[model samples]
Target: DTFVSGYLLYLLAASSEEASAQFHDHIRAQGLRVPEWRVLACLVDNDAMMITRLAKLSLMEQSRMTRIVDQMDARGLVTRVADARVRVRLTDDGRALAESLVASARAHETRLLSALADTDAARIKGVLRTLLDVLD
Candidate 1:
C-alpha cells in the first residue's frame, strides 16, 4: 500500500512537470517571463498591487521581482504608476494579459483533470482543499 502511494505521487509529480512545461512554452511564446507572468496573473485577480506586495504574494524575492517589473514595464506589458501619496498600481495592459492567459490555463487544467468524472473531480478538489487548509 505504501509502495502504491509512492507510485501515485510520482505520477502526480510527472504530470505537474509536463503541465508546467507546456504552460511555460505558451507563456514564452507570448513574450512573458515567469515572474512577469506570475505578477500579471495575480493582478488579474486583484487589479492593483504594490511591487512589494506582489513579490510577497508571488513568493519571489523583492529584488528579482523589481527586475521583472522593470522588464515588463519596458516591454509595455505593464506599467507602474506611482503617486507621491500612494503606492503604485499596474496598468490595464497587465490586467488584460493576465485575463487572456487565464482562459488558456483553465482549458489546460480541464484537460489535465479529464481522467476523472465531474463528480469525482469535485470530490478530489474538496479533499485537496482540506489538505491544504490543514497545512495552512
Candidate 2:
C-alpha cells in the first residue's frame, strides 16, 4: 500500500519530537539552548561569519540570530570581531564546547539509527537529502 499524507505527517511529527527530545537532553548536559546549539553546530565547520551570513546559513532570522549571538557572547561561547566584514568567531571555549557536543550528537544519532540496517539507512538518508534539496 502507498503511504498516505496522514501517515507521513505522523511519521514526520514523531521523528521531529524524538530528535528534539534527544538533542535537548544531550545539550542540556552542556547547558545550551536550542538556538545556541544550532549556531555552534554551524560554526564547527565554517569560519567566522558575518551576522547576515550566519543567519542565512543557520536558517534563522537576523534578529533572532543577533539575540542568540548576544547570549553566547555573554557566556563566553563566542566573540565578535570588528573587521571590514564585522564577523563573529567562536571563542576557544565555544570551539571546545562545540567539539564536545558534536561528538555527543553524533553518538546520539548513531544510536537512533542503530535499528536500521546500514544499507537501508543510507538509502533513506539519500532520499531525504534529495527531498530536502528539492524543497529548498
Candidate 3:
C-alpha cells in the first residue's frame, strides 16, 4: 500500500482544515466571513498594521485583501491610515468583535484538546513548534 495516509504534511493540513471548519461555522454565526475575521484577528493586536503584513497574516492575496479592506471600511469596522505606508486598524466595534471571537477561539481549542490527555496535547503543541522552527 502507498504511504500517503501516514504522510506528515497531509495529516497536519487535514487536521487544521477540519479543526478550522468548526471555528469557521462559529465565525459565520457571528456575522463575519473567514477572511474578514482573519483581518480582524490580525489587526486586533498591533494598533495598526501595514497592508503587506496584513496580507501575509490574513493568508489572503493583496488584491483580495484590498477588496475586503474596502468592504470593512464601508461597514465602519476598519479604517485605512497612511504614513507613507498603507496601514489598517480596527474600529472600536471591530475590536469588540475581535476580542469576543478571540475568547471563543481559545475555548474552542480547549474543547478540541479535551479529547486528548493534557500531556498529549502539550506534547503535540511542543512538537508543532519544533517543526515550525525546523522548517522556518
Top-scoring candidate (lDDT): 3
Residues 1-136, candidate 3, lDDT per residue (tens digit)? 4677889888888988998999999988988899998988898778998888889888889999889989999999999876647888999998998888888988988887777656656567778889889998
Alpha-carbon shift of residue 4 in model 3 (angstroms): 2.8
> TM-score: which candidate is best?
3
Q: lDDT by residue for model 2 over 49-116, one digit each (tens)? A: 78888888777999999999998999898998875557888999999988988888888878777756
Clashing pairs in model 1, backbone N/Cα/C closer than 3 A: none
Write the number of the candidate with greater lDDT, choosing between 2 and 3. 3
Off by over 4 Å in 3: 118-121
Error of 3 at 69 (Å): 1.5
Per-candidate TM equals 0.71, 0.81, 0.88
lDDT of 1 by residue, 15-115 (tens): 55776798889999987677777887777766567888889877799889888878877877676665542234456776677888988888877876685
Model 3 residue 130 CA deviation (Å) reads: 1.8
- TM-score ranking from best candidate downward: 3, 2, 1
lDDT at position 54, candidate 1: 84
lDDT of 1 at 38: 81
By lDDT, the better pick of 1 and 2 is 2
Off by over 4 Å in 2: 1-10, 118-122
